[PDB]
Amino acid sequence: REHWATRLGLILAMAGNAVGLGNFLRFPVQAAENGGGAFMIPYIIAFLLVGIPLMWIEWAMGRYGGAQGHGTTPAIFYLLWRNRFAKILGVFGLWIPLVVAIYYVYIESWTLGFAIKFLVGLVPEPPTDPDSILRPFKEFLYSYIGVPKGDEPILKPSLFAYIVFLITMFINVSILIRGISKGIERFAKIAMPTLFILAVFLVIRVFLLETPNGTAADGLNFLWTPDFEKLKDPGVWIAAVGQIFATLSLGFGAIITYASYVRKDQDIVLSGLTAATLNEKAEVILGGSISIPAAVAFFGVANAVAIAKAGAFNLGFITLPAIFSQTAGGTFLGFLWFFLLFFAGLTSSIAIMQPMIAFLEDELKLSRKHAVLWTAAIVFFSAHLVMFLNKSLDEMDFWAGTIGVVFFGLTELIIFFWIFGADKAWEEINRGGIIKVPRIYYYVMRYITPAFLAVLLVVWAREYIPKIMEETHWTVWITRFYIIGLFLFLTFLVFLAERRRN
Numbered sequence: 179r180e181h182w183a184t185r186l187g188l189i190l191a192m193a194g195n196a197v198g199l200g201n202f203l204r205f206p207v208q209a210a211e212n213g214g215g216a217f218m219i220p221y222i223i224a225f226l227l228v229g230i231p232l233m234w235i236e237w238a239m240g241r242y243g244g245a246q247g248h249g250t251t252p253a254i255f256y257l258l259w260r261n262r263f264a265k266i267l268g269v270f271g272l273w274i275p276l277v278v279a280i281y282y283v284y285i286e287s288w289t290l291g292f293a294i295k296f297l298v299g300l301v302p303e304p305p306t307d308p309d310s311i312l313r314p315f316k317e318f319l320y321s322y323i324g325v326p327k328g329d330e331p332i333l334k335p336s337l338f339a340y341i342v343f344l345i346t347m348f349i350n351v352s353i354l355i356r357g358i359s360k361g362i363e364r365f366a367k368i369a370m371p372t373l374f375i376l377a378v379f380l381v382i383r384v385f386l387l388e389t390p391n392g393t394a395a396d397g398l399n400f401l402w403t404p405d406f407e408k409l410k411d412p413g414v415w416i417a418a419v420g421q422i423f424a425t426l427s428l429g430f431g432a433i434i435t436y437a438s439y440v441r442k443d444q445d446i447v448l449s450g451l452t453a454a455t456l457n458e459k460a461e462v463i464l465g466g467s468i469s470i471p472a473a474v475a476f477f478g479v480a481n482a483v484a485i486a487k488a489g490a491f492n493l494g495f496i497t498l499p500a501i502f503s504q505t506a507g508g509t510f511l512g513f514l515w516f517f518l519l520f521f522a523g524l525t526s527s528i529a530i531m532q533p534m535i536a537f538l539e540d541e542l543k544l545s546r547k548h549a550v551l552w553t554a555a556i557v558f559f560s561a562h563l564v565m566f567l568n569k570s571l572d573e574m575d576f577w578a579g580t581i582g583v584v585f586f587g588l589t590e591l592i593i594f595f596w597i598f599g600a601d602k603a604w605e606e607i608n609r610g611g612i613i614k615v616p617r618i619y620y621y622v623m624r625y626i627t628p629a630f631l632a633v634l635l636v637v638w639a640r641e642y643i644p645k646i647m648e649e650t651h652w653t654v655w656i657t658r659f660y661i662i663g664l665f666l667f668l669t670f671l672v673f674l675a676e677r678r679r680n
């Protein structure tokens with residue numbers, strides 16, 4: 179089996195896995211919509227009672243399976259629990275990362291395209307009216323991704339966006355095709371430092387933004403000022419947990435696959451903790467100190483929250499660059515922004531394609547080249563659905579990146595810490611560890627976390643089951659149909675692998 183060259187490379191690789199678009203795009207929106215500071219508390223709690231334990235658990239499962247030449251959940255679940263149904267459940271460990279990759283890589287390509295156009299200086303040129311200043315950039319984004327006037331099902335992506343998507347795929351491939359240490363690790367050792375530097379620079383530059391309408395410091399205060407009136411709102415907790423799952427790459431089967439390339443004797447406790455901590459730092463300190471503080475700086479708190487509620491891509495692709503365009507050298511600043519977004523996105527995407535690649539290598543005994551090329555082909559082909567169908571991206575992100583990750587987290591936790599055995603699981607987690615996990619977390623992994631995830635899934639189900647059947651748009655049905663098809667396909671591949679074993 180292939181392994182990580184150095185411990186530093188491993189750390190930066192996992193960090194590259196976690197630190198992504200979710201830190202600089204999703205987090206600011208989630209925090210703004212949930213009352214800033216009021217969102218932090220639950221967040222932190224969700225990080226302590228869900229993020230960390232699941233992180234360690236996925237590291238342990240990953241290394242455990244990897245020691246036996248298996249990097250994906252279809253086989254690992256079976257190793258932990260002898261049953262076909264365990265493999266069937268394991269299919270999600272490929273389905274989720276594949277589906278998520280499908281649109282994630284596309285958004286990444288967006289950030290790349292914007293990076294290029296902003297570098298070359300091909301951007302809209304605003305003239306004191308906000309709606310105005312924002313309009314040109316809105317039209318810019320809409321022209322880029324081909325957004326219809328009213329609410330129409332067909333998207334008309336520009337040729338440039340398509341070509342840039344091809345390029346993005348090419349970059350992902352060029353990295354993944356080299357392998358774990360030659361490809362992912364090498365790239366991480368550069369992209370990560372670059373990312374942190376750009377992030378810090380942007381943070382400082384944004385902090386210097388001050389106008390008659392507000393300052394960045396106001397944004398920082400709003401984000402770090404506690405509010406206990408929202409603690410009774412279940413939605414805030416749900417959003418916190420969801421953000422934790424998303425930002426830590428939990429339930430995506432990515433952490434596991436990355437961990438399968440960690441030598442059996444190497445520690446996964448301190449390494450995992452370090453990766454998670456790095457992610458949280460990049461999220462609450464870097465991600466939260468850019469978009470929101472700027473929006474508040476220019477338009478104020480209220481308007482910033484409104485914009486945040488307007489959409490996820492509205493803040494990162496429209497509002498922020500529109501704000502930068504009003505400052506000296508704002509175009510270049512925008513470039514730095516989108517470049518940062520690009521490196522983060524890429525460092526995540528390779529991580530979410532590695533599960534499929536790894537399955538092709540370990541179970542179907544395909545070479546790395548073939549595995550990478552076929553995975554790339556599948557993702558690229560499937561991407562057209564996201565590119566040309568409106569509301570498709572949202573549907574995939576919902577079924578895979580929202581419900582699926584939680585369901586899968588609960589599933590893996592139950593299989594590893596209950597069926598496989600709590601004591602054996604614990605011993606497996608701590609074994610070889612440079613530091614030992616606090617005893618309390620034991621009781622946290624066995625009782626608290628699973629209970630939380632269960633309750634969450636129950637509420638979600640209760641709320642969505644009636645809405646699902648009654649949905650007008652046909653694009654969502656096409657998407658559902660297709661991703662179901664993907665699930666059947668992966669199940670079939672698992673079947674073929676199983677038959678090959680015999």
Ligand SMILES: CCCCCCCCCCC
Nearest residue numbers: 367368371372373375376
């Ligand atoms: C292997 C060392 C990599 C160093 C990366 C430096 C990048 C500097 C970026 C400045 C914005």
Ligand SMILES: CC(C)C[C@H](N)C(=O)O
Nearest residue numbers: 196198199200425427526
């Ligand atoms: C799906 C994951 C790779 C997402 C990543 N953890 C992020 O924060 O963007």
Ligand code: NA
Nearest residue numbers: 196197198425
């Ligand atoms: Na993250």
Ligand code: NA
Nearest residue numbers: 197522525526
């Ligand atoms: Na990343």
